[PDB]
Amino acid sequence: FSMMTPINDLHTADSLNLAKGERLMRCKISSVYRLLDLYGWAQLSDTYVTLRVSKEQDHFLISPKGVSCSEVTASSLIKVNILGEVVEKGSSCFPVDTTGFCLHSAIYAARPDVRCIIHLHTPATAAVSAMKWGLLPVSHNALLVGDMAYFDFNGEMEQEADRINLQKCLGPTCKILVLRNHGVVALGDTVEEAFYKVFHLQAACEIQVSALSSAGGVENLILLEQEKHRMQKSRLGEHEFEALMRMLDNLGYRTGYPYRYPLVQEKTKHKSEVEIPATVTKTRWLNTPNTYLRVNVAPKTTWMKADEVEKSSSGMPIRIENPNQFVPLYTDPQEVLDMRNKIREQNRQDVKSAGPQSQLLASVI
Amino acid sequence: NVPNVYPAAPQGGMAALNMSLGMVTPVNDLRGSDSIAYDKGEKLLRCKL
């Protein structure tokens, strides 16, 4: 019953303070939230994905507390600082809790190159993280994910010691972190790369859970070795996210994502020799076959035949634009029949009336 | 143009979006004047694929 809402929503707002790249970033984060809801991975209110707009100004964008992922729009998100204070009040009139942002802020304090941080709480990811041994390279998606790090999570990152203990365990160059008994976190320089890593890790974790449950132990898995595996240009996740934005736009969703490679739709046509070429490059009129010309008296007006030897005009047109022009519009029908009776019964009564006489005869009398 | 996307189950977004796109975009667009251009055997295989 039309649950869809426009993701862009920048048209309706007409308010607040935004940077030049703020529109694209807000559309990207809201489209990510919609895609997380629409895959069915996450459904309730939390702070899953966080973004960095400016590298030298912080001002991270987070989701307000109490909004489902289907109801996320671009204007409703909240821009904050590194510490977590609300520097920009969101459009949504909801109470603001910025507690879960703190872990993302610690990861932001660790790496300068990270811009997108995605957290997952799906059942398969949590089952993998709760498992004692690490994620096994038993799937092609897990091989494509790459390296990873494991960190024990106590559920709170308010303490300074926990923040300074995360930094060395995360590593200088690492893309995938696993919070034990809590899920997975993916770090991306771009939003699309982080989304790609999230999707591949997500598929790989149900693959590993299903294979591990059905097989029994590790021996039957015959796991592979990661070491033996080892326009302009695309950057890891451009094509997939572009296709997703294209199809979402075809749903009627308004996404602010612009396309590096736009799409051309042409039916085209096959020429057939049997087909013949296209080969292209009220008023009633009364005609008069002659034309009369006015000639001065040789005063009395005179009109002239002007025959065809003198190159006269051929056809004179007379145009009638309406019917019944010959008859006046306003007329009583009884009058004509009355006058017919008046004229006729003088025959019946046989008058002695004579015609009119000219006045030249009257003068001499 | 109000495509009227179908409602989805909590685990069934893929199915609902797929049938909405099936309602919007037909899979056999060759019908009409364009059906002559392709071969009779080839067009049927394209539709099946």
């Binding site: 057939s272 049997v274 | 002559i36 071969d39 009779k40």
Partner: peptide, 18 residues
């Protein structure tokens, strides 16, 4: 191509009429 396309088309008027 055109000849055997009308071949087929007349085939489906036979199929379709009765």
């Amino acid at each position: 191509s055109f000849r055997e396309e009308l071949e087929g088309l007349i085939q489906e008027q036979m199929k379709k009429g009765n």
